[model samples]
Target: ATIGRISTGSKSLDKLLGGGIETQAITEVFGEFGSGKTQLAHTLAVMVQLPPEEGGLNGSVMWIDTENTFRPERIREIAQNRGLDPDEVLKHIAYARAFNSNHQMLLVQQAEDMIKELLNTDRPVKLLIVDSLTSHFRSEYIGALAERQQKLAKHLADLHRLANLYDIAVFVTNQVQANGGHILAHSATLRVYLRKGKGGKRIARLIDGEAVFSITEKGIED
Candidate 1:
């Protein structure tokens, strides 16, 4: 059976994602610094609110910003550009900032609670975005390597469970030295790597990581 897909607001990018990010799965997007990781997250946040005709889930977004990079102004720009109500879009998006590793991990549980409360609303959250998913864990768990890996693994498992339990599309970003094995080894339902681009023609390099993929004012491009 065909599953539900959420449009990323970019046809080219959506094509690369098999029609769009699917519900009931966790999607991990990783790249080096300044590779448009958070940009994609912001774009998807706005894209998820669009109606079905425009390739959205006609739903809300729950954004867990761990690195404090999320900007409402940026989201407004994307939403307005896409012909959506900027204020309304902002209202539909529930943002939570996580300060530490433990808080970041626990936000998943709190988000689950929020999800339950919003289900009876006009726009239920269908997308969960964790920007720079490993920032908190990477910084706080520096005390022990083996212990850090264990924590990362367990954190991913929690997110994986949420994706399936809520049947929501989960998008997470990560920074890595060689494609983020710490998280990749744990695995997501789908994974994609991104690289910086210049001149706007579009560029990407795929690997054992699964896929390669982009972002711009037009939204995310592949």
Candidate 2:
């Protein structure tokens, strides 16, 4: 019954979601340029490396950088701040960057293979991330809204299947547009909309920014 139960590795956020992120399901976190979206992803990247008992996977992580938002050294620094073994922590994380739409999909397609090979020949990958899943497509498909949406959906669907096929946690980031009650809001699973404060601090709330993360038939739970 728990086909897609993963954790975000943040005690606050995870507990808010009744334990953690749903594993084997796509958990999406999105915001503006400096809305702590990637920060949350990077945080999860390191947090998932802890022992399973601590609500972590204790396994390797796969970071797919569509916009090249990954920094292994920065990840290590975050881990060190938490008093974790920087080397051992960094050891479990891997990254792949994609420059364009085709290349991005190709990299996504390679996810299963990489996971399999890493699991079989070496070690297993527990957490997988696609930071800014719709960035390239969003930029390219400006006039072609429907087409862009379709392509974006397809890519995310692949990520969905891969997570289920391998039972790995999938974390994705997206760029949010303020269209106001458009279809774009409906496509997200765990859609989190963040905004920046006057002090340049990122806050995930409603009214000004957004706090629509939990996905339900009623709509995104604020």
Candidate 3:
């Protein structure tokens, strides 16, 4: 039924994402430099390893690291905090460091091979994460705007296809640039723009383009 899934770091945030993140969908988490987007991805990696009853898929995480933000240590601590076996958590995740946009696209394009190799065999990649999907693509085609959009569209389409073809949840992080008046936040399965916290807890606002969320955490609420 729910082939695609969503994970909110906090229970309250889940309610904000329209009941829950749609299963078999691509969620785009875009925000400023340090808005905890990757943290959410890392947390999801751990969460996906938990049993299904605990709001998790109990599956493996395919983290495509374009920016080298896959902090296994951070996830270790989070899993430890949750009383989960850190080693078991680590086993369920697959990591690959992408050198550039071309390599990134190749990985996305050839994702089916990896998916079949992993999921079709035994451990399926239930969660796919692309840390900062826009950076490398934008940097590669700074002047060629049209080319960038078209190329990006294909990769994004592949990502979406992976969600359906493999029936896994895809999560991507994006960097926000000044579009015009307000930031442009219209892309990915679930688009969220996390910003700073004016006073205490950060606020999650739904923009005209997509649903935006604010990120703030204990020991570091911003």
Q: Which candidate wins on lDDT?
A: 1
CA lDDT of every candidate: 0.79, 0.66, 0.70
Model 1: how far residue 187 lies from native, Å: 1.7
TM-score list, all predictions:
0.89, 0.80, 0.85
Compared with the true structure, the alpha-carbon lDDT of candidate 3 equals 0.70
Ranking according to lDDT, highest score first? 1, 3, 2
Candidate 2 vs candidate 3: the lDDT winner is 3
User: Model 3 over residues 133-182: C-alpha lDDT tens digits?
Assistant: 87787778877877887877888888888888788888887777567212
Candidate 3 Cα misplacement greater than 4 A, ranges: 120-123, 179-187, 208-222
Query: How do all the candidates rank in terms of TM-score, highest first?
Result: 1, 3, 2
Could you tell me the TM-score of candidate 1? 0.89
Cα lDDT over the full model 2:
0.66
Once superposed on the true structure, which residue ranges of model 2 sit more than 4 Å away at CA?
1-9, 120-123, 177-185, 197-222
Output the number of the TM-score-best candidate: 1
Give the per-residue lDDT digits (tens) of candidate 2, residues 153-222. Answer: 7887888787777877788777765662232355445655566666444445321122223312211222
37-89, model 1: which lDDT tens digit per residue?
A: 78888988988898888888788889999988999999988888889989999
lDDT of 2 at 21: 62
